[PDB]
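step 4 of 6: structure.
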Amino acid sequence: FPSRKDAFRAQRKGAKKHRPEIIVIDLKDHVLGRAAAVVAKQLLLGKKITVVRCEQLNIAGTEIRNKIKYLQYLRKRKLTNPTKGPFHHRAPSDVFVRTVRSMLPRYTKRGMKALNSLVAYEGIPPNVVRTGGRVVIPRAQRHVCYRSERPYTVLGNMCKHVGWKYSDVVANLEKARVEKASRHHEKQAKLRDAWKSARKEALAKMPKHNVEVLKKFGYA
Amino acid sequence: SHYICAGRLVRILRGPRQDRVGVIVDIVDANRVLVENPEDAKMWRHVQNLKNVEPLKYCVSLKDALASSKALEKYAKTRTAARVEAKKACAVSTDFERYQLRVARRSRAHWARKVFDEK
Amino acid sequence: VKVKSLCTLQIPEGVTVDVKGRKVTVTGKRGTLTKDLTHLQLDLRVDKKNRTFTVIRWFGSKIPIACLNTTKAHVQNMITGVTKGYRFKVRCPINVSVDGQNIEVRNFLVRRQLVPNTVKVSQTEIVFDGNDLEQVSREAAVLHQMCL
Amino acid sequence: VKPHLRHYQVVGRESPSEKNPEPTVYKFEVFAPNFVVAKSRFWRMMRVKNKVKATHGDVLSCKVVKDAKLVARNYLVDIAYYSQRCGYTRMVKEFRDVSKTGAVSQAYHDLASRHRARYHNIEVLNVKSIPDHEVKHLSIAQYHAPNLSFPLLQRRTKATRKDRAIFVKKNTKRAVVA
Amino acid sequence: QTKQTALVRVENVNTREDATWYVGKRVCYVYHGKKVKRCVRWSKAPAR
RNA sequence: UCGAAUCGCCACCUACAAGACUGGAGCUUGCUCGGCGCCAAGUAUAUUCAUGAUCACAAGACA
RNA sequence: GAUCCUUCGAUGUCGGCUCUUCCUAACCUAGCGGCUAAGGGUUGGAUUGUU
RNA sequence: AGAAAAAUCCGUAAGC
RNA sequence: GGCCAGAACCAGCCCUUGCAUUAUCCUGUGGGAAAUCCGGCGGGGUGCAAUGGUGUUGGCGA
RNA sequence: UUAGGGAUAUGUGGCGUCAAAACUUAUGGGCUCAUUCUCGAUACGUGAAAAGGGUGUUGGUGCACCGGCCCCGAAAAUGGAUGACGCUUAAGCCCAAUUAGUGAUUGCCCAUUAUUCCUUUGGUAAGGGCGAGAAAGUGUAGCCCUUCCGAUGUA
Ligand SMILES: [Mg+2]
Ligand SMILES: [Mg+2]
Ligand SMILES: [Mg+2]
Ligand SMILES: [Mg+2]
Ligand SMILES: [Mg+2]
Ligand code: NA
């Protein structure tokens, strides 16, 4: 929430609304560790990144193996005062953020700035839905990283079985969002077809040598 | 999907002979094949890995059989060959040609806008 | 590493099999049976005119070969179930009440079990009727384990 | 890739002396990385069999043997390796390559992978190309059938090195970063 | 680290053959301070 | 106060799923039949640019 | 037992009382056909400075 | 400078 | 102001096919249609060499 | 193996992030799935034996044995350690390459080391001289100029 001084400065200056350059990554069907390493290096290089759909990351192996690994992690606590001990976060976005934090140099101001440059969500929230197209990391995708015969696990199911009470909430919100987007995209089909037809028809009216150059370069 | 078989036409993906078309003349093993093409000067008989080929939809069944099949003409006619030639054209281009392409695209966009408004 | 391994089956007239994305749907006189096979990575093919069903494995070790036979057996059981169906019999003082979809047992040597919708249970000595073998066998095994 | 070994022929002799005015001349075939290793293997074999040390010997010639035209053939490689608690072991395997050097390099990689055997413990007895009707194993016999064909699945095809990207648009070929 | 040499990554340059093209070029690093000090054309062009 | 670093934008991207998967058929089961944007509102007939004097934060902006 | 590495301008020594925590090769309690299981329990007195 | 916000009225990313 | 920058030139330094061997080889003319393979006859790709100077153009400095 | 500083190239060790280097290289071959200390994974050095089994192979022949990887055998006291995260179409293990069957030569990263350039200091030192400049000289603000070699260190 902005302060009244910040609002007054903005009003007095009169400049228009500003948004910095932010990359939004759709993390569905990505390998957790490879995605974390790539994102950590980009954060250190100076990018602002927002990751969505953190509950559909992938890990290799069976859910039972990965759940046993998490329980072993959860067993560690400072015996003398557990309120100081390690804090075990159960949500998939917190799991991703902790993996990245362990891949960063966290006890330095530079590493702290890098870690604060990252935002993580489950699903796609309304303040992110309409900001532009999402990206993928092609060198960290499951269909090219795992052999197809081997089993794998989805982060949401494992996190649900170790804690994380909000799986059903996220599922309902995602279903509603996809329904709304599907309705909107079913609309505008006529407009898209009209623009495609206009593009096809303009060739008959533009100059012939321009058409020839387009055909030569393959934009025909 | 297109199968790997004797006489099948393939395109090379990477390497010094990339974006070239040849014919499979012998299956050495699960990973390697022998490729030749009399038409191309650089495509004499050699060994290629199967990670470096893309099968096409033509299979002759050597120079006489290839000429009779006329798969080279069909490949020249399809849209992939057009894309490859356009990529080579874009690669070898000058500032003047880039300017000409820019004005052609701007002309097409303007006329598309006019047609859309008219309709 | 064998290049190609094959297994094929014939389809009786009046029954149809459709495959799409490793999803199998067998339609017969009795009804439709759906099976899931996304955890297999096989090559399923159907030719209606020849009334043949085949499954292929390319460059496979012993395990894929072992999985091919089970796939064929499952498809065969599916077609048999949609063609004629299954009817299991159980017979054992003990008073067992068929009721409707609830099985109650009392005075053994009260145990209650819920019967799934797809299976229709009746008392002649009870009779289990289902369109697929797995559900009927599961119901019989559940009843046996309860009465033990 | 091209094979990492070469086919050499070393011809040698013992230096003539008064007790031995006309010594015997021997011919040796070896697959080696370079001709220094070829000569070393030659003198090891000569000492181990004929009781002739390198310090009283002569090397008459060493040359590299050329290979035949590129044709897919079946090769029989007769090989022997050493490992402790097993003694010397001799095995015969059939490969499928385009040259003798390729078949022997395949054999070396196979022995290293399956038995942890290394170059200085392996010895090659014979290599030859056999006709297609003398193959006794199905895994090699299946490649000379008349109707052999298969599709390419699970292809992890990458991009040209100059076009690789770090972030790309979700359903598009547009690079966002790189 | 040795501070007298710096490493720079340029967009769309992803090969050693590409990075060879840029040898000899000039790089800037713009920033800002807290007070107005002298610049190149201080007297002529006081708009700088 | 305040001058500052940042230098693509869009009611055509900003919906979705699968890679043993990709338009429709046939049986012969492997064969056959993003858009714009880069100096005339648009590819032609036009029109002001200095002396800011040979590099210097772009002396310019928030399309 | 062996040893002699630290400490001789000093690191307070047996038993009991009091109080907390951890282990398992499971005495009881709990499931199986000897196996699993460390979750909760495991007493009060005569003689003796005792263990 | 980054919202698990929004995109005559009210009610419908519709007809409204 | 040799205070700060740019370009140019000298010197030095760093980088950037030949001839040998070509044969277990190449090429025509019983076995497994053809090919892979084995005997008869005829024709022929790897070791060396090829910081220092000497002015010029701007900025700041009245 | 060590005077005060530049540039170039290496040794041991490495090239997913921490952390410089394959923005996760290859147009190389095989093997491996590991459910509560436990799949592996930098020697010296800090994790194990007899016996028994799964997946890929090898002698023998008309079934027996005999090796690669993995599992069982394998039980302790604060919560914890391939360094951490993580990795399985490896970022694991055994071999092999250098931009790949296209045709001569070195993929790249990091030292108080090597080569080279500038400056100091000392010699079992070696030569020359006697418009501002020169002293017949062990040692200075060194009489002046050129040249080569060494330079760490407790008692
Ligand atoms: Mg003692
Ligand atoms: Mg030392
Ligand atoms: Mg790095
Ligand atoms: Mg000294
Ligand atoms: Mg002293
Ligand atoms: Na390490």
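step 5 of 6: annotate
 - Residues 149, 151, 153-155, 169-174 of chain D lie near RNA strand F (CB under 10 Å from a C1').
 - Chain D has three helices and eight strands.
step 6 of 6: archive
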